[PDB]
């Protein structure tokens, strides 16, 4: 399997810097051109930069918006993807993706999974967890964190179907979130539901049964 | 820096209709070297990566099936779904690689489906955030079409503006409806002022508000 990955993101300071790596397996690395490219929230997609493959000479190309400012490089022992990135403004809020380009063989272009990156002078926070008890419809309340991403999941995800999990909205520096969940009337309560909350930034793991009453 | 141009932003149609979506760019994507246009296409779903279904304006990625086709030269190209299927939904945008690569705005596919009710639910504070004298009261409405929908907070027979905050999924493929949450937040002491707390929720599905309460005294 191809794999990429994107590591070196997160929360930082505005004027700092970051270098986003992406970890790359299952393919000749050296063969390919490397693009970065960004999504803020809610918006389009936008083209950063590639990097060409080893028979040009791994030479490097930017939009005009970053050029200057951002760099690209390779680690071509280890098959790794860099993207340098200096001075950093609220304008580079976003997820981050690798993609591999183009070049040789027989059979696709693939994409990394993506990394957030928040420039903010906030501080990270972790979340308040709350039960939200009464086919009937539990959830769980995620209050007062920063930054994004939060995961949640209900019965270490052995329930999926019936799952809804709203988008965050933030005010004054903190991200609320709210997660529904759907059951048959008749499992509960008699079989237990349990709201799982993952906010990697502050290294918080919750569990938060929905206790009816 | 060519600049390209998508349109339109959105459009809404039945699993199984055909549709058509177009780019334009500042100028020709077509190489003279290779006679290719160096335009592509890629969809990007809900919560996922965008990936590619379609380079050198027409032809399809290996993979991808034969429904989705792309069109044109030059400046204008158009990409086409015949039977769109409901896993389509996502937002499709153009990309140029014949000078740097630029991606176009994006065209968002909604899918159109059957007229449904939300299930509205709704949720006292829970003892533990009371603890701390906060006091969230919320509201979920799940599962509707058509998308708009409009929410309001009655509280012991008196309409409340503020203290809301409003969030909305993004459309489920599983059954292309929306959903909306709606939360109220007050302090603790304002919170136990009142005793009678009502979401209603106005749907094109009803000229009657759909309206879920709890009163205070009876927690």
């Known amino acids: 399997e191809v794999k990429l990955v994107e590591s070196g993101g997160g929360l930082v300071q505005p004027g700092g810097s970051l270098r986003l790596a992406c970890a790359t397996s299952?393919?000749?690395?050296?063969?390919?051109?490397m693009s970065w490219v960004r999504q803020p929230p809610g918006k389009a997609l936008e083209w950063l930069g590639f990097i060409r493959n080893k028979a040009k000479g791994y030479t490097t190309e930017y939009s005009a918006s970053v050029k200057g400012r951002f760099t690209i490089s390779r680690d071509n022992s280890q098959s790794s993807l860099y993207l340098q990135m200096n001075t950093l403004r609220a304008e580079d809020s976003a997820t981050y993706y690798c993609?591999?380009?183009?070049?040789?063989?027989?059979?696709?272009?693939?994409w990394g999974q993506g990394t957030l990156v928040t420039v903010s002078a906030a501080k990270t926070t972790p979340p308040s967890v709350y039960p939200l008890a009464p086919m009937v419809t539990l959830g769980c309340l995620v209050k007062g964190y920063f930054p994004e991403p939060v995961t949640v999941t209900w019965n270490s995800g052995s329930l999926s179907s019936g799952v809804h999990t709203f988008p965050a909205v933030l005010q004054s520096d903190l991200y609320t979130l709210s997660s529904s969940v759907t059951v048959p009337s008749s499992t509960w309560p008699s079989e237990t539901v349990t709201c799982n909350v993952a906010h990697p930034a502050s290294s918080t793991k919750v569990d938060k049964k929905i206790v009816p009453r | 820096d060519i600049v390209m141009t998508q349109s339109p932003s959105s459009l809404a149609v039945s699993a199984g209709e055909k549709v058509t979506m177009n780019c334009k760019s500042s100028?020709?994507?077509?190489?003279?070297?290779?006679?290719?246009?160096?335009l592509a296409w890629y969809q990007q779903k809900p919560g996922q990566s965008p990936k590619l279904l379609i380079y050198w304006a027409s032809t399809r990625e290996s993979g991808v099936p034969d429904r989705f086709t792309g069109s044109g030269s030059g400046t204008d190209f158009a990409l086409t779904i015949s039977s769109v299927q409901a896993e389509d939904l996502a937002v499709y945008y153009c990309?140029?690689?014949?000078?740097?690569?630029?991606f176009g705005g994006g065209t968002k596919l909604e899918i159109k489906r059957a007229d449904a009710a939300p299930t509205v639910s709704i949720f006292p504070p829970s003892s533990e955030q009371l603890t701390s004298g906060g006091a969230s009261v919320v509201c979920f409405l799940n599962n509707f079409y058509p998308k708009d929908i409009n929410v309001k907070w009655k509280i012991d027979g008196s309409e409340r503006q503020n203290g809301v905050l409003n969030s909305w999924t993004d459309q489920d493929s599983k059954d292309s409806t929306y959903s909306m949450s709606s939360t109220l937040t007050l302090t603790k002491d304002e919170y136990e002022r009142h005793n009678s707390y009502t979401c209603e929720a106005t749907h094109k599905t009803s000229t009657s508000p759909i309206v879920k309460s709890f009163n205070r005294n009876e927690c």
């Open positions: 100028q020709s994507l077509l190489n003279s070297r290779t006679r290719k246009n160096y």
């Open positions: 299952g393919f000749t690395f050296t063969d390919y051109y």
């Open positions: 993609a591999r380009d183009h070049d040789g063989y027989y059979e696709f272009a693939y």
């Open positions: 990309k140029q690689s014949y000078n740097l690569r630029t």
